[PDB]
Write an enzyme that holds these catalytic residues in place. Structure first.
Site, PDB file in Angstrom:
ATOM      1  N   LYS A  44       0.840  -1.197   0.000  1.00 54.40           N
ATOM      2  CA  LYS A  44       0.000   0.000   0.000  1.00 54.40           C
ATOM      3  C   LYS A  44       0.884   1.260   0.000  1.00 54.40           C
ATOM      4  O   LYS A  44       0.375   2.368  -0.114  1.00 54.40           O
ATOM      5  CB  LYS A  44      -0.936   0.030   1.212  1.00 54.40           C
ATOM      6  CG  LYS A  44      -1.849  -1.176   1.432  1.00 54.40           C
ATOM      7  CD  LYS A  44      -3.044  -1.330   0.495  1.00 54.40           C
ATOM      8  CE  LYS A  44      -3.993  -0.152   0.464  1.00 54.40           C
ATOM      9  NZ  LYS A  44      -5.279  -0.492  -0.199  1.00 54.40           N
ATOM     10  N   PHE A  85      13.560  -5.493   1.248  1.00 52.22           N
ATOM     11  CA  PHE A  85      14.755  -6.117   1.808  1.00 52.22           C
ATOM     12  C   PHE A  85      14.477  -6.888   3.113  1.00 52.22           C
ATOM     13  O   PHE A  85      14.803  -8.107   3.191  1.00 52.22           O
ATOM     14  CB  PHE A  85      15.775  -5.014   2.060  1.00 52.22           C
ATOM     15  CG  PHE A  85      16.909  -5.339   2.989  1.00 52.22           C
ATOM     16  CD1 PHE A  85      17.644  -6.491   2.821  1.00 52.22           C
ATOM     17  CD2 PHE A  85      17.319  -4.419   3.923  1.00 52.22           C
ATOM     18  CE1 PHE A  85      18.732  -6.768   3.626  1.00 52.22           C
ATOM     19  CE2 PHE A  85      18.404  -4.690   4.724  1.00 52.22           C
ATOM     20  CZ  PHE A  85      19.094  -5.866   4.593  1.00 52.22           C
ATOM     21  N   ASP A  90      13.104 -11.798   5.871  1.00 55.76           N
ATOM     22  CA  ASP A  90      12.378 -12.377   7.022  1.00 55.76           C
ATOM     23  C   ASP A  90      11.526 -13.583   6.610  1.00 55.76           C
ATOM     24  O   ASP A  90      11.314 -14.495   7.422  1.00 55.76           O
ATOM     25  CB  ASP A  90      11.459 -11.353   7.706  1.00 55.76           C
ATOM     26  CG  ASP A  90      12.220 -10.216   8.363  1.00 55.76           C
ATOM     27  OD1 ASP A  90      13.441 -10.388   8.680  1.00 55.76           O
ATOM     28  OD2 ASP A  90      11.605  -9.166   8.534  1.00 55.76           O
ATOM     29  N   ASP A  94      11.427 -17.090   8.466  1.00 58.62           N
ATOM     30  CA  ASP A  94      10.202 -17.553   9.132  1.00 58.62           C
ATOM     31  C   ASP A  94       9.589 -18.760   8.443  1.00 58.62           C
ATOM     32  O   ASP A  94       8.487 -19.192   8.823  1.00 58.62           O
ATOM     33  CB  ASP A  94       9.118 -16.476   9.116  1.00 58.62           C
ATOM     34  CG  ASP A  94       9.578 -15.245   9.871  1.00 58.62           C
ATOM     35  OD1 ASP A  94      10.339 -15.435  10.870  1.00 58.62           O
ATOM     36  OD2 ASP A  94       9.255 -14.109   9.421  1.00 58.62           O
ATOM     37  N   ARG A  99       2.567 -13.684   1.006  1.00 58.42           N
ATOM     38  CA  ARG A  99       2.732 -12.343   1.458  1.00 58.42           C
ATOM     39  C   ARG A  99       2.088 -11.446   0.414  1.00 58.42           C
ATOM     40  O   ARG A  99       2.486 -11.495  -0.767  1.00 58.42           O
ATOM     41  CB  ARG A  99       4.209 -11.964   1.563  1.00 58.42           C
ATOM     42  CG  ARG A  99       4.445 -10.465   1.491  1.00 58.42           C
ATOM     43  CD  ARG A  99       5.781 -10.064   2.040  1.00 58.42           C
ATOM     44  NE  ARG A  99       6.092 -10.705   3.318  1.00 58.42           N
ATOM     45  CZ  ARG A  99       5.924 -10.156   4.537  1.00 58.42           C
ATOM     46  NH1 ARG A  99       5.095  -9.141   4.693  1.00 58.42           N
ATOM     47  NH2 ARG A  99       6.616 -10.599   5.580  1.00 58.42           N
ATOM     48  N   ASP A 161      13.794 -10.733  18.211  1.00 57.24           N
ATOM     49  CA  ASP A 161      12.510 -11.416  18.040  1.00 57.24           C
ATOM     50  C   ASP A 161      12.815 -12.911  17.959  1.00 57.24           C
ATOM     51  O   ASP A 161      12.368 -13.665  18.837  1.00 57.24           O
ATOM     52  CB  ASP A 161      11.669 -10.789  16.919  1.00 57.24           C
ATOM     53  CG  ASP A 161      10.233 -11.301  16.714  1.00 57.24           C
ATOM     54  OD1 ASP A 161       9.437 -11.511  17.750  1.00 57.24           O
ATOM     55  OD2 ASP A 161       9.865 -11.462  15.508  1.00 57.24           O
ATOM     56  N   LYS A 186      12.329  -3.271  15.721  1.00 55.85           N
ATOM     57  CA  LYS A 186      12.032  -4.073  14.513  1.00 55.85           C
ATOM     58  C   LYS A 186      11.121  -3.349  13.504  1.00 55.85           C
ATOM     59  O   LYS A 186      11.269  -3.607  12.291  1.00 55.85           O
ATOM     60  CB  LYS A 186      11.362  -5.402  14.854  1.00 55.85           C
ATOM     61  CG  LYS A 186      11.102  -6.315  13.650  1.00 55.85           C
ATOM     62  CD  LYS A 186      10.541  -7.643  14.082  1.00 55.85           C
ATOM     63  CE  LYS A 186      10.250  -8.585  12.950  1.00 55.85           C
ATOM     64  NZ  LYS A 186      10.425  -9.983  13.398  1.00 55.85           N
ATOM     65  N   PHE A 225       0.733   1.047  16.393  1.00 51.84           N
ATOM     66  CA  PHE A 225       0.491   0.452  15.096  1.00 51.84           C
ATOM     67  C   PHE A 225       0.608  -1.081  15.170  1.00 51.84           C
ATOM     68  O   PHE A 225      -0.214  -1.803  14.616  1.00 51.84           O
ATOM     69  CB  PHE A 225       1.508   0.953  14.077  1.00 51.84           C
ATOM     70  CG  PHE A 225       1.338   0.320  12.721  1.00 51.84           C
ATOM     71  CD1 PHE A 225       0.199   0.550  11.980  1.00 51.84           C
ATOM     72  CD2 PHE A 225       2.301  -0.502  12.189  1.00 51.84           C
ATOM     73  CE1 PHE A 225       0.027  -0.011  10.733  1.00 51.84           C
ATOM     74  CE2 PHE A 225       2.142  -1.041  10.922  1.00 51.84           C
ATOM     75  CZ  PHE A 225       1.000  -0.803  10.209  1.00 51.84           C
ATOM     76  N   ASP A 229      -1.736  -4.034  15.150  1.00 51.06           N
ATOM     77  CA  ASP A 229      -1.435  -5.037  14.144  1.00 51.06           C
ATOM     78  C   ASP A 229      -1.669  -6.446  14.722  1.00 51.06           C
ATOM     79  O   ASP A 229      -2.230  -7.314  14.055  1.00 51.06           O
ATOM     80  CB  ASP A 229      -0.018  -4.843  13.594  1.00 51.06           C
ATOM     81  CG  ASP A 229       0.158  -5.341  12.171  1.00 51.06           C
ATOM     82  OD1 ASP A 229      -0.730  -5.068  11.341  1.00 51.06           O
ATOM     83  OD2 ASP A 229       1.183  -6.002  11.908  1.00 51.06           O
ATOM     84  N   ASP A 230      -1.264  -6.662  15.977  1.00 52.90           N
ATOM     85  CA  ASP A 230      -1.410  -7.974  16.670  1.00 52.90           C
ATOM     86  C   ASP A 230      -2.864  -8.272  17.079  1.00 52.90           C
ATOM     87  O   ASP A 230      -3.302  -9.428  17.058  1.00 52.90           O
ATOM     88  CB  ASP A 230      -0.496  -8.038  17.894  1.00 52.90           C
ATOM     89  CG  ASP A 230       0.970  -8.008  17.504  1.00 52.90           C
ATOM     90  OD1 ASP A 230       1.282  -8.396  16.353  1.00 52.90           O
ATOM     91  OD2 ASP A 230       1.776  -7.596  18.349  1.00 52.90           O
TER      92      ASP A 230
END
Ligand SMILES: Cc1ccc(-c2cc3c(N[C@H](Cc4ccccc4)P(=O)(O)O)ncnc3s2)cc1
Ligand SMILES: Cc1ccc(-c2cc3c(N[C@H](Cc4ccccc4)P(=O)(O)O)ncnc3s2)cc1
Ligand SMILES: [Cl-]
Ligand SMILES: [Cl-]
Lengths: 336, 336
Positions: A44, A85, A90, A94, A99, A161, A186, A225, A229-230
């Site tokens: 976005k 990047f 990541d 992960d 995505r 993390d 992060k 944010f 987000d969580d």
């Protein structure tokens, strides 16, 4: 969408310039193109846009010539490349699958772990663009320093993390002190501070008090944010958000789990230690339900109101001598 | 070993400084330490040492104070950190097992693909050291630009290599034009040019003619170094070198294979296409033997003599106004 149009049309140039009388690297360059096309596009573009909008709000309408504007759209794209990047890299780390509803770069047939070098090029492009478009400007070094530091802030963070949340089922690690610390390094510096900070330098505002004050507001917006987000990953209507969630399903150190961990009788630690991180839906459900029975959606509402009040005090106390419109622009977006 | 002593004792400081009143990142920093200890140490340190030796040869014995020297040992270590960065990351990409007779970082229990973020921190450290030790100096920006460009030269290169040599058994890709191009981008700029170039900037020699001339000598030394690197992998006595070889055994785009491909009747392309890249020793052998029956060890000798003559002409024509001792220092080492 008021200035989103021109931002995304300028991409096509970004690529034209990154990709060109050194003939036999030609193939490596081909591939760089593929890399950017696939990985810089389809978000976005909020972070990169923040640089442009902020640059316009920060400068004398006089000194906003075609060249000025050329450099805002670029340094905006430099931020979207920083993100690509971290994101590519990541997603390997992960073992992610998709995505932006779209297969991750590294999962594509023929890419795999080559994606490592690909991510490194995404990062290299930042500094090529800065040289190509700003080498002359008084703030050239400030922008290199900023991006570099933003990279390091972010990497320190991801490290924290990873150390916190082995993809090794452990909740003792998931603390408030630590969560605030993960989010700050992060996501918050590169997502909130980098872009306002870049725009300020472009504007000739480089006092470390001004930046000291801007960072303060922004880092706290960053916390909200992510905390929001969580929340949404689980309870957020997936059509309103645009994602199924795997916060519980992937042993994440969520805000949710942190607060559930703060608010839970031993008999509840177990039911969490029993089904947090499991693939089975039956298990994914008997946490969600624990969260619901700890009125955490309601604890989120309580935090959102406080957080909101607080951002405005911080804006009141620290925005000067920048237009609050810089901060309220972001606050508007993030508090949806 | 004349100046290798102090270089390796200074490491302990490099780490002291990279690792420190921001309490809860403390753990991420712990891990950074582990990362550097394991990945920056255990080489022969030639590239980093080139900066120190060159700095001494390039400056007025007057202006070589403790501070000057502090910065040479650092920018030397900045080069050894650049390398560790490519090395950790390439070793993942190649699915390597050991390196310096020692298990690769990513193969260690608990690291794996976290090694991606680890490599990124190795790279970030470069720019932290440059800020901590040189922010004040006239050549600060020149050193950032150099390292950044050296990173990009190297990444472009690895991309070319990956595109050339799928870990997809293909020899049509393995051309001389392409090999020279891989070596130049992937190994030569960061191994030969970066370190002399860094020392020059530190010395206040920043004319792009001077650098134009230095790069010319150095890039050609880079070609020889690698071409020799590829010879020895196979025929080089493994005690003299310090490595078993997997140039054939891992489908590499060697100098060897390139020259064998230039010099081979169709009936020989097949025997190569038949057993290049196989794990079986019986197969690994019936290439080696083809190479031997194409007098390629002898073609190497022929190239080494020519190359040598040529480096000296290039030194004769382009070293000025630098001491040839800068170039002959390297030439001495590499022509063992
Ligand atoms: C500096 C800055 C300012 C605003 C944002 C926003 C992101 C965002 C947003 N994100 C998407 C995902 C998402 C994040 C948070 C809440 C809901 C969805 P994505 O990363 O797929 O574009 N969705 C809806 N509105 C916004 S506003 C980001 C950075
Ligand atoms: C700028 C520059 C100058 C000299 C060198 C050298 C490397 C090297 C060397 N390498 C080892 C491996 C090797 C490379 C080439 C030939 C034989 C061994 P490693 O990387 O395990 O330290 N071995 C013996 N002598 C030398 S001299 C590198 C860069
Ligand atoms: Cl202008
Ligand atoms: Cl000094």
């Amino acid at each position: 969408a008021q200035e989103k149009q021109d931002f995304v049309q300028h991409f096509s140039q970004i690529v034209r310039v990154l990709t060109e009388g050194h003939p036999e690297i030609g193939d490596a360059i081909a591939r760089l193109k593929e890399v950017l096309e696939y990985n810089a596009i389809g978000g976005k573009y909020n972070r990169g846009l923040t640089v442009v909008v902020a640059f316009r709000e920060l400068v004398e309408p006089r000194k906003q010539d075609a060249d000025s504007l050329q450099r805002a759209w670029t340094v905006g794209w430099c931020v979207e490349l920083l993100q690509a990047f971290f994101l590519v890299a990541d997603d390997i780390m992960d073992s992610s699958l998709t995505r932006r509803g779209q297969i991750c770069w590294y999962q594509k047939p023929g890419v795999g772990l080559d994606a490592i070098n690909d991510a490194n090029l995404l990062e290299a492009c930042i500094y090529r663009l800065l040289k190509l478009y700003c080498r002359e400007q008084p703030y050239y070094l400030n922008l290199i320093e900023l991006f570099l530091q933003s990279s390091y802030q972010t990497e320190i963070g991801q490290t924290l993390d990873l150390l916190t949340a082995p993809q090794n089922v452990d909740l003792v690690r998931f603390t408030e002190k630590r969560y605030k610390s993960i989010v700050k390094y992060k996501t918050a510096f590169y997502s909130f501070y980098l872009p306002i900070a870049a725009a300020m330098y472009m504007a000739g505002i480089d006092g470390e008090k001004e930046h000291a004050n801007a960072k303060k507001i922004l880092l706290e917006m960053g916390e909200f944010f992510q905390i929001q987000d969580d929340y949404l990953d689980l309870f957020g209507d997936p059509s309103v958000t645009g994602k199924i969630g795997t916060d519980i399903q992937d042993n994440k150190c969520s805000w949710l789990v942190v607060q559930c961990l703060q608010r839970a009788t031993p008999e509840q630690y177990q039911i969490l230690k029993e089904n947090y991180g499991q693939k089975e839906a039956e298990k994914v459900a008997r946490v969600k339900a624990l969260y619901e029975e700890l009125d955490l959606p309601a604890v989120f509402l309580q935090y959102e109101e406080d957080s909101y009040s607080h951002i405005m005090a911080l804006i009141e106390q620290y925005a000067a001598p920048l237009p609050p419109a810089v901060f309220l622009g972001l606050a508007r977006k993030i508090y949806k």
